[model samples]
Target: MILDTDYITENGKPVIRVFKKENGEFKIEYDRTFEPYFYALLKDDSAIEDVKKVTAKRHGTVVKVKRAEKVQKKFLGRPIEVWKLYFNHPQDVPAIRDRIRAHPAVVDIYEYDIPFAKRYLIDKGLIPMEGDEELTMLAFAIATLYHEGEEFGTGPILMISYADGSEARVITWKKIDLPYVDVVSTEKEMIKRFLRVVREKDPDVLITYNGDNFDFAYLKKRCEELGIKFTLGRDGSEPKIQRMGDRFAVEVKGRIHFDLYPVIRRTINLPTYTLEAVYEAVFGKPKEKVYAEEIAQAWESGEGLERVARYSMEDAKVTYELGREFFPMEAQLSRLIGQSLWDVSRSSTGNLVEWFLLRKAYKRNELAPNKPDERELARRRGGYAGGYVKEPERGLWDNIVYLDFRSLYPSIIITHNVSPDTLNREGCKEYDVAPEVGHKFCKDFPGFIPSLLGDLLEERQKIKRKMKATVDPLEKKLLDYRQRAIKILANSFYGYYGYAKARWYCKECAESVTAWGREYIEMVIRELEEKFGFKVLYADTDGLHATIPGADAETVKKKAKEFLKYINLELEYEGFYVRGFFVTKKKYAVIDEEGKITTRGLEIVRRDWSEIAKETQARVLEAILKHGDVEEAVRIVKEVTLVIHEQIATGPHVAVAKRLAARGVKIRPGTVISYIVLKGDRAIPADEFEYYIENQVLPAVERILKAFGY
Candidate 1:
């Protein structure tokens, strides 16, 4: 045990220190006698001699005996070598790791705790994994359950179960407070019996929160211990558990098991991917407590069992609510990607898009390629000047219009015939060619990706038109969901070509698509300024925002929409802002004709900025852009300066980035770093800054402040 642990450079020698609290004073205890060790790896045939050579090169000797073992290949299951190599000095671990990786004989190198399977998956692009397959002719119903206990290995004990609708076989330890699913037997027997009933209910889609790792895994073990069959699949198959790189999933044949956490983790940035957190984020619902620990205590006491039962029932209800929200998207994704709803719901956009292309390949008898080995995948790592972003003016402006290319990348692919099979540079004639990279493609026949996307685009457009014309709310929602799914799948085609893990990884296709995108955007900008008499304020890859004096915003919007006929691809007028401020390329604030404020890449919406800074920035911007008064903005800024003075130590929200960076976490370049400040300098990562901001203060805010400022 130690009060504090840190590294001290003692005379250019790295020394570890343990600071102990003796009385109220702190005393440093030097630990020069501590042992240091690290691990390395070597190939199947390179015996102990290779290890000796590696150690010799690094000015060290092997401290642990080398062990050889076999492992399954990452993408495909095949026997391979597994080795564990170790040496002295933890400081040299990185160097040793680098040295081992550099060696041609080395297969892999990592810590003793890090599993070989994990490393294998990481190399095969599975850790950052997220897939799709076949058709299931089943009517999908959604349901959820509430669970208690950490896991089976750690004192896991199921107390309550809940599901949606009146069909639930209600459960309760005693007379429940509300509607419940009860079983008339011992706890284990009750669970087994109720689960059996649920299985027969045959929900084609089972939505869950960590059901794979915790719920199903725990249930399976419990059932096994009690000699229960645990048949929870439509085809009477027991639930299957499959490793997903760093995590695991429970699969049930004939029915799609969609765990919201994995897909949620990939798509949304949140404080936690827990059911409560995600539900709240997506549905604006508050988290309900089940008193899981209290339920365990109440089990023996036989007190308040009904409360726990009711809580469980409510928990299931919320899960069902979540399913209702996401189920439409799943259905849409299924059709768009040509996969079962279950697979599409759980898979990543890249994975889904690849499967979509694979379907086309299978139809055309093109023979979809196998996944590339790690080395080949690594070759397609980096390149490209991505997307042209330029802001001609950076100040408050009036009467601006925002317009952008509709499905720019996909449109470009279709227009240019960008496909792996179509790429031909040799003796290319008059037609298809890329502007930036000089990649050429044949136009004699429609390419796979282009033709496939074009079909989807056309289908998506048709659905949208139908959705718009539909008067019934339910019908409209259903049609819109389908169109949205098509959009998500179609948009991913361009990126799928660049995705190394994707089967259709075509660098030429991806590059040429972007090249065309950049060119098209440039052309639009030129046309807008020269022909349309619009003063260009800003422009990005497929979007532009500019202004020209106009009497009627509606008339200007109509003209802007009509002007799209000049461009080769479809263009849409995004909005007409009464006034706007261009801070930088993507950072701006604008107020539209309807007085709705839209912010992009500004302090008000950025997570890295402190509440004070963001609020202050918004108030200042509101005055400057909306009211167009410098004196009012200056007054607002002066008032904020006082607020800033009071909280100067925590005024700026820039230090969290530095903290996470020091820990070597890879975040997007421009994303706001969100974290919770703990005792001392420690910070636990948070999904959203609002989680921390809510537990703070505020000042005189609304109308009078707005009234006075204006």
Candidate 2:
């Protein structure tokens, strides 16, 4: 089975290098048979002969078009013939494309902007990281020797851990008598030894925390200064630091350089993405803390080196564990999109959707529209009416039932047959019309996007069923990952239509989807309030929070189930909350029967609020929701204020970062600023009791209290 793939230039010809695992080892197989080609639409069928004669010059070399053939492909649900132009090399496509596009015969071009590596994989129908092969993985971290007022550090300490699904070993530069840790004496020896280990182990995947911007980059630079070739690939080729938009990507020739930074940044939502923070978020345990500012002192003293070594080793270990945790989902997505794991790891949600659509188009013999130019993108940059949001009735409620539509946007797309190709402003026979937008979709034939989403939803349901029946934990986990990947792709279809860079960009389709969403949710709301005698507390896009008058939890649950049956759409009974506090649109808190509270758009869940303020608000909410004790909630607020007063009596401290900055400290952007106002002109480094009570704590709790007519 193919583990990974890459392309290399041999004698100015591109060779696809396929990595395979056999008998506990990875071997590279090279293929040079495939040629790169793209399609072009001609102004007239007779102009194909003229386009065949076009040639261009690049880098002082005359690049000629190798071959041009007439091919039939579908364009926008209609059949058309286009010129499929083949090139000698992928690099020659751009120059030749520009020359042909200038010719009077060529009308436009398509599929010419895809990356060469991705194009190779798509054309060859290769799915990377297939099957349940136990891949050899390596994780490494470095602690750089920092100096005062210096930007870059030198002679960094390195630590690496190797794992093959079961067994593991750690390697370090420091002389430590620890099990599973191999030690090296000097910095140069450490660099050389790490490379040797990589070659000997031949890991299929290399894991690192910020390897793109930090670890691998630093190592590559250091190796060059020491007159050492930083060869880490199976082909002995050094990793290349290629620029991808504003960031950098370290591309290894054969093995997968899976950086956990960008992957975690996209998957997890957090205020701070430090290694320790992400480690705790994923593993629920605090990582060993050795501050970066103290690393120089620790390295110089020689006594604290062990602490640094342990920290580095722990980072690598945590990175390895995180890689294992996120790999299943990423691999599933890679297979689904028919792209490489490296690209999948770095892709955004929209990019993933686009890639999946592109692959589907290729399979269907459909020609994908070219990406919009800057002018076209600017023209498409306009907003439409979004999901309907009804402001909540400001008060506390009892016996609340929260109801949600299952995959609302995706369901709307499927139900309405929404897609760019089927959208029509003119009257159509047997069509579904959007309520507010008045856009019509032909119902006689299934639209492309809706058909794809229907398949995804059905496949996800099947996978979930398999998950429920499977007894093996590993198989269940893989199934769950597969379903989640499908769900992610399925949900992105609506947003992709509105994306400015989308190949099938259509604003009308996106607008119509939301219109149908609003129509359905409002219809359900009307039915619940008027016919069912339920008091509607809040309603948003695809969910509703309501209550039955003078009813118990069991009654509310029964009513909710009945309402779900009455609704024509796929609505779900989320839960029957014993208590709920409604603040406003898209903001509320509800407590389930088990006394567990879930909050949305509250200060307690926001990252900008101070920790103390968030804690105080949470306690206040608990007091009110759990016990309905307004007196105790007020008392909790007063006690927190008293503690803040005592903190204010203390003198100024380093906690007042803003004050330090005012004293000419070089604080950069995104630095957390903490300060206290004093009676005089100067601010102090003390906790302002009044500020916390007035600006932070009071506002946080006052909203909920005010909702109750306080």
Candidate 3:
């Protein structure tokens, strides 16, 4: 039955929300929008009596219930939620089930830094606006649809982010959208229709991981042309966002837009993950002819458009459902950030850039910050090209921890006191916040971040320095927590000024940052050598790789704390610094004390593992680092090798030698036929091991003995 219930007048009141019972009865809610439909359905006895509520509480489920107070429009209390549309058919049910099972899941990397968002705030000298969500959702919706295939519109421009974490793609070219698909057109019409879809769908707020840059810029170009509003959630509706050019996604209303590329890119990047990767990795099987070209070729011949339409709907449904598989990770990280994560302060793009440029000057050399230019532009996009890890090197070099510049390039802009106006050298008198070398905070005209970190740095240094003498465990614990908090906040500043969607992506801001960084690195190294009497092994970006001799836990912790003070001092001038660390006396093949091998994280390939060998190596090397005894390490390794001899030579593993002694035509079980062929020993399974062991293994042993270790 389609009708279950109807609105009724009881106790001199009219019921608005109502539903039909499964057996064709009526129930009504005092406040709701479904009354009319319920009443109508009740008249026909076609409404379900008891509502099914199992999946409704989760995301992307389209079953209708009472509308959420936040959702609006004709959709209110209708079958659709602000985000999802109801579509259920027997055919759709199974198709959607299979598609969802085989659907490619989405992944997230990092947040957009958000610099352009900051500029508008600073321009009006405005206190930051609280929320701007609608614009965000609208932007993502249009962008995702428009970016579906070949460059949409008059775009000589196509946006590209590197497969590695290094470069970005924002260019124009003449290409068809979805080259393999037949419905081709320029981005103009593409933009128009996509927004129309959004207007039609009217989702509450667009959801993404970092879609502001990857999805929004391209989307806005179209809205700019048609003169339409594109706002979903700009200020507060942080539905989260993420993006990668090829498979970018946007979600609003009940719909969940997903960008699977970044998630996949970080997890694994191959010649092509091509649906095949998803199926094999997640489900353990090939995707049997479902999306294969054979069926697609038939569609081009015009015989399968109907089937294709079914497939398309299935594709969209699966894209949304499968993406839900990624929810656990997002929720986990969200819970972890808490209030410790700083929101971007209100400021104009120009002011933010100016602020960052001024910030970098506090370091020793205090080189003047650079403003935005083609040079700086390339640097802002620098990460896309550089995976930033050094190529494999020999000995100590290959296994060093990359104490990166806590968002290195971004920090450069913030610290050097860079700004579009500053770099262009406009209004220089208004924006000088840091001294030439970041030694002290500017007392007369303190910058926001410098002022912020000054107090934090002072407190942290006191705690860290006191740790060396403290017998109080509680004090040490508090100091450690304080140190960690300061670290996370400090590092976030580097990525502050290099992104359009990020609260910081100002070129002027970033340029000054690098300038300040170069300046500070020089001073810090001097301090390590001259004042602290510690060795500065290597330094780059935001972190310094160094250590103190005979340092105890408290002293080492104190050194880390002192480093934070320096970062805070620099940040006060510049606004960014290093976060946490991979700090240890153990760094390379022979660091952080003897006996330990290299850091596995530093190694490129660790498909094979040997922890026992590392422990043995560490014991040997401890003596070597302390007393220059290299031979003992070798001797220790040889001692460990004795077990291998027992296993291979006289154990059950050598049954093959006896088998050869009784040689005859033997093919059953470990039976053997003697023959000579290979120049080397080879591996074989149990049934086969004896065969190779007799014919090949013993002979190789004889040859090696004959050659005498040749």
Candidate 4:
């Protein structure tokens, strides 16, 4: 056995520091690595030559980084030599060793294999994860990362490291919640105290959803005590991950820090991409029932405070669970997507639609219309980035009897035949929808993601059916849940492709299709609103809506159907109506059909989804946004606000910790603090329309419905 200089003594025992780079500095992590695997792997790798360490070579995309600059005595840059590697795997380290051998550029790797154990610490829970470890375990991670807008959120990276020294893991974030200040607070307000908490109960990996970016970023800016060294290995050398402005990053040094958020989006379900949304959809976690005022009040109460901590921990565990679920499967589709892109671009990264179509092109032995210059093609603005309109508001129709023309974008890919090939005007359509960008949504068939997911979904359903017929009831439930998860994963693609925040997709594709969609929907809405005396209340990307107070659901449906019929006739096979939900005069869902597959499938999903996550939130929001009855929505939002406030005010260690203790005296941590406030004036919970329409500055129009006119 051999040892390396990467090992440092913490209170006399060996320790590893996970750091991230930020603001041109590597802010060393003070928190202990929760899991020992990365450290153990480093130890084992150190025994061999630099060329023999495999897993220690390059941390996969599964990892996010935090920065820590080593200042032997004072804070400043240090030499990059004398680096070490810590691998996070439970078994099969030999594969890493083989890679190390295969690539002579590798170095030492250290690891500790943590075999699966029954984590029995926080077992009894009253929430949706009440009876299971898997759910709660995942919940803890989610809770920590989704703690809204804490001034400084802290957490860890959870990976499955190996004993034989080779393993790959889908990491997620977990937390040890301290206080609940807004994001702008200084280190003087929280850093020292946060480090103290980390000292008290250290875990393997300091997990966080975006911990590498936010919490650690702030830590670098605020750290007054520069005596300690924080380190994490990256690219076989120790580097620090840090935050500067709005970004988080790592340097070319050593430290094992990671962010779990991006990878999650690049893979998993894309709809309602927020971690908060994921828990509700997957674990059946109940939506919160409190708002800012109630939270303020709760923070002052003892019971309320305890609930907050429990909730925070639960959230952290949930994220961890999510991390566990995605890997051995969720990542496959994303990687395949990535690979397909690389096949044509000769780059590891590409947009989803491009990758999907490229893979199809490869299969059919197709060539690009003309080879694109690497520089020109890779240019970010070529498609998605520069397509935004200065007046997006001008393009948006506030009340035009909004119609989605369900799957309009996909339909365009079908009718008149849109495909990746045609995107460059190279295929039979010879219609170049995506010119310079060189990416398209359609290929010979539906597409790779759609087809791949179809098969996966089919397999998942079969697994459920088999489980149902099997002898074990437990297996049946697991399979059933898995089946549901698979369905969510498949369905979430539309949202992923459309969401600008989704890294796996390009906004250009999203907006282009969206722009095209607007034209068709507007065509229909104009005919209905102007010709048939209908008025549109609102229309978003995939939904249509109209508000006619006196008309019932049936009337709305009939009129919408008439409009749909007119649209099908006018579009001449390019567009059609999907379906409409008569939510209320103030709110409704109008889904348009793209084609036969989507028209039926989306309708079933809409129907079978007995419990809707974002829609419920949206409905509540609509009431608050438009001039609807806000009594109920306000009540629930207030309730949740109180619960979060309670956690911040009463957490034991947080209050006692001097860092927050000083701030505690002056500000007193308001009970009704808004997460929006944490984001500053520009960013808030309510959208632009909601904030303006639902503001306390204006009087509520509860009597608007009381008008008795002819």
**lDDT of all predictions, in order shown?**
0.58, 0.76, 0.34, 0.35
Kindly list the per-residue Cα lDDT of model 2 for residues 1-710, writing each as its tens digit.
Answer: 56667677888788877877766677888889878888888898898877888888877988888888999998877789998999888888888877788788788899988877777677777777667777778777776665322334355544554544444555666666566567877666777887887788788789888889878877876787777898997778898888899789997877888899999998986646899989897787889788766776765665666666667667777888999888778888888777888888998878899998888888788889989887877787653335678988766689898887646889888888898888883556788988878888888778788888999989999999999998999999888888988977887777778887889877889889888777677777889988888988988765788998788778877877887788753566766788888788877888877676777766454333446776888788898788777778878878887222111112333334445556565434323334444432334543344665676677778776666666
Candidate that would win on lDDT: 2
- lDDT string for model 3 (1-710, tens) is 11111233454333332221223222222332212111011121122222212122122445333311222222111232121112222122222322222223211101111122222222222221111111112212111221112233323212111111121111112232332222325444444444445455443223333443344554555556656555432111323333434333343322233344445444343423544455345445443323324343533465554443333333333333323443223222211221100121112233333343333321211222233346656655643211112122212121122234454433333444343323333333444433342222122333434444444456556767887678888667545555654454445455454553332344444444654656566665676557766555544454545445445545554654565575453332121111112222222323332222222222222211233433554455444443344465445545654011111142332343445334442233212222222221321222342332342233222221221121
Residue 511 error, candidate 4, Å? 11
Error of 1 at 596 (Å): 11
**What is the alpha-carbon lDDT for the whole of candidate 4?**
0.35
lDDT of 4 by residue, 1-710 (tens): 00001224454333433333333333444323422222112223343454322333233433211211111110011112222223333222333434433443433222212221100000111011111222111111211221223334232212111110121111112222334311213323333333333333322223345554443443443342433233222333323654444455542232222245555555444345555766565565653433333434444342353344444444455555554554223223333332210011111123343434333333433321222335545653344422212111111112223444444554433342332222333343333354344345434434334445456556775886798689987666656665654443444444444434233344544454555655667676678668776765545554545534455545655666676676571222222223233322233322333211111111212211112222344444444334234565555444422001122222322333333334452223311222121111332222111332233111222121112110
The C-alpha stretches of model 3 lying farther than 4 A from their native spots are 1-486, 495-512, 545-606, 609-629, 637-710
As a TM-score, model 2 comes out at: 0.82
Worst 10 residues of 3 by lDDT: 36-45
Using all chains and alpha carbons, the TM-scores for the candidates as numbered come to: 0.58, 0.82, 0.30, 0.36
Model 4, stretches more than 4 Å misplaced? 1-208, 211-312, 317-350, 357-403, 419-534, 537-543, 547-549, 554-710
lDDT score at residue 95, model 4, on the 0-100 scale = 34
Better of 1 and 3 by lDDT: 1
The better-scoring model by lDDT among 2 and 3 is 2
